[PDB]
């Protein structure tokens, strides 16, 4: 099994999983052109598309891909039913692709209907979980995003976080604005900066390591609580999470 990234727009990645026969799965294709080129260049045979949510940079390419490859099954949440989805899926359901069983996980936050797809070790989490960060709350509440990250954090340590955007460096700069003396965050920031100085991709990341350097997965850590509670006297986890996400909104 091979995991490939195809850049699109300014900072999107279209993930492609292909098996040993060249059959492939395409995740969140917002621009069909680079995907079509890679399919041709690599002799891939597209079998399915996964959509995580309805935003344009994630679904814009479906029509052209489906016209070129009429056999493609398009999986997605109810909120993409008008975006070319042919199999609506929801929490707890499974999509069988490339001989692998992908579990569907509802992760409201970025959008209300956002879903994630998991088949060990691959986690396609769209704009919910980023390396060092999480999605901006356009439609979901902070409580919902908090609960969605709790669900993703419970996945196995060897999970590969395949998120949709190259946000890692900015996410880690924010992390240092909150915990500037955390050695793990500093070390990861410097590694991510080194990659981005050479315009290299920072993904996928291993979930085990995200637990250490993603401040949005460290809501219940005493060191973060003490920082957050020195600004606002907040007593509940979802309130502290909202504080941190609001701070990042203006960073
Ligand atoms: Zn989005
Ligand atoms: Zn996006």
Q: How far apart are CA 204 and CA 17, in angstroms?
A: 13
Handedness of CA 120, 123, 129, 131 (dihedral sign): positive
H, E, C per residue of the chain: CEEEEEEECCCEEEEEEECCCCEEEEECCCCHHHHHHHHHHHCCEEEEEECCCCCHHHHCCHHHHHHHCCCCEEEECHHHCCCCCCEECCCCCEEEECCEEEEEEECCCCCCCCEEEEECCEEEEECCEECCEECCCCCCCHHHHHHHHHHHHCCCCCCEEEECECCHHHHHHHHHHHCCCCHHHHHHHHHHHHHHHCCCCCCCEEHHHHHHHCHHHCCCCHHHHHHHHHHCCCCCHHHHHHHHHHHHHCC
CA Rg, the chain, in Å? 18
**Method of elucidation:** X-ray
82 is in an annotated binding site: no
* Cβ contact 197:222 at 8 Å: no
CA dihedral 123, 175, 180, 193 (to 10 degrees): 70
Q: How far apart are CA 115 and CA 88, in angstroms?
A: 11
Residues for the chain: how many in total? 251
Handedness of CA 98, 103, 104, 110 (dihedral sign): negative
* Cβ contact 75:93 at 8 Å: no
Q: Provide the CATH number for the domain around residue 85.
A: 3.60.15.10
Q: How far apart are CA 206 and CA 160, in angstroms?
A: 5
Closest listed residue to residue 34, CA positions, set 1, 2, 7, 52: 7
* Cβ contact 166:201 at 8 Å: yes
* Cβ contact 3:204 at 8 Å: yes
68 is in an annotated binding site: no
In angstroms, what is the span from residue 59 Cα to ligand 2's centroid? 10
Nearest ligand for residue 54 CA: 1
Distance of CA 124 to the CA centre of its chain: 6
* Cβ contact 106:144 at 8 Å: no
Nearest ligand for residue 130 CA: 2
Q: Which two tokens stand for residue 83?
A: 């975006």
Q: How far apart are CA 165 and CA 10, in angstroms?
A: 9
Q: How far apart are CA 58 and CA 143, in angstroms?
A: 24
- Measuring CA to CA, how many Å separate 231 from each of 53, 84, 193, 234, 236? 34, 46, 29, 9, 14
Q: How far apart are CA 147 and CA 238, in angstroms?
A: 9
What is the resolution in angstroms?
A: 1.8
246 is in an annotated binding site: yes
In angstroms, what is the span from residue 234 Cα to ligand 2's centroid? 30
Domain count within the chain: 1
Closest listed residue to residue 56, CA positions, set 83, 85, 16, 76: 83
Give φ, ψ of 246 to 5 degrees.
Answer: -70, -40
Q: How far apart are CA 63 and CA 175, in angstroms?
A: 38
In angstroms, what is the span from residue 110 Cα to ligand 1's centroid? 6
Any bridge partners for residue 130, and if so which? 133
The 10 Å Cβ neighbour count of residue 56 is 11
53 is in an annotated binding site: yes
The 10 Å Cβ neighbour count of residue 77 is 24
Write the Ramachandran bin of 92: left for phi over 0, alpha for psi from -120 to 50, otherwise beta: left
163 contacts: CB under 8 Å, gap ≥ 6: 13, 125, 126, 127, 128, 129, 130, 131, 203, 204
* Cβ contact 65:26 at 8 Å: yes
In angstroms, what is the span from residue 86 Cα to ligand 2's centroid? 21
- Measuring CA to CA, how many Å separate 24 from each of 3, 46, 117, 135? 10, 5, 15, 27
Q: Which domain holds residue 99?
A: 1-251
Any bridge partners for residue 115, and if so which? 106
Any bridge partners for residue 101, and if so which? 96
């Amino acid at each position: 099994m091979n995991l490939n990234s195809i850049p699109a727009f300014d900072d999107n990645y279209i993930w492609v999983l292909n098996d040993e026969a060249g059959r492939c799965l395409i995740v969140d294709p917002g621009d069909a052109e680079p995907v079509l080129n890679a399919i041709a260049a690599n002799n891939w045979q597209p079998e399915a598309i996964f959509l995580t949510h309805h935003h344009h940079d994630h679904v814009g390419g479906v029509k052209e891909l489906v016209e070129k490859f009429p056999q493609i099954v398009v999986y997605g949440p109810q909120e993409t039913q008008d975006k070319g989805t042919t199999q609506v899926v929801k929490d707890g359901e499974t999509a069988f692709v490339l001989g692998h069983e992908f579990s569907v996980i509802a992760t409201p936050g970025h959008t209300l209907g956002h879903i994630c797809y998991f088949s060990k070790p691959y986690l396609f989490c769209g704009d919910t979980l980023f390396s060092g960060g999480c999605g901006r709350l356009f439609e979901g509440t902070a409580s919902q995003m908090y609960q969605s990250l709790k669900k993703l954090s419970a996945l196995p340590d060897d999970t590969l976080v395949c998120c949709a955007h190259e946000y890692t460096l900015s996410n880690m700069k924010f992390a240092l604005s909150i915990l500037p003396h955390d050695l793990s965050i500093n070390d990861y920031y410097r590694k991510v900066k080194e990659l981005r100085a050479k315009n290299q991709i920072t993904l996928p990341v291993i979930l085990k390591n995200e637990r250490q350097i993603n401040v949005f997965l460290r809501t219940e850590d005493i060191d973060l609580i003490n920082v957050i509670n020195e600004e606002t006297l907040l007593q509940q986890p979802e309130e502290r999470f909202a504080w941190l996400r609001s701070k990042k909104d203006r960073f």
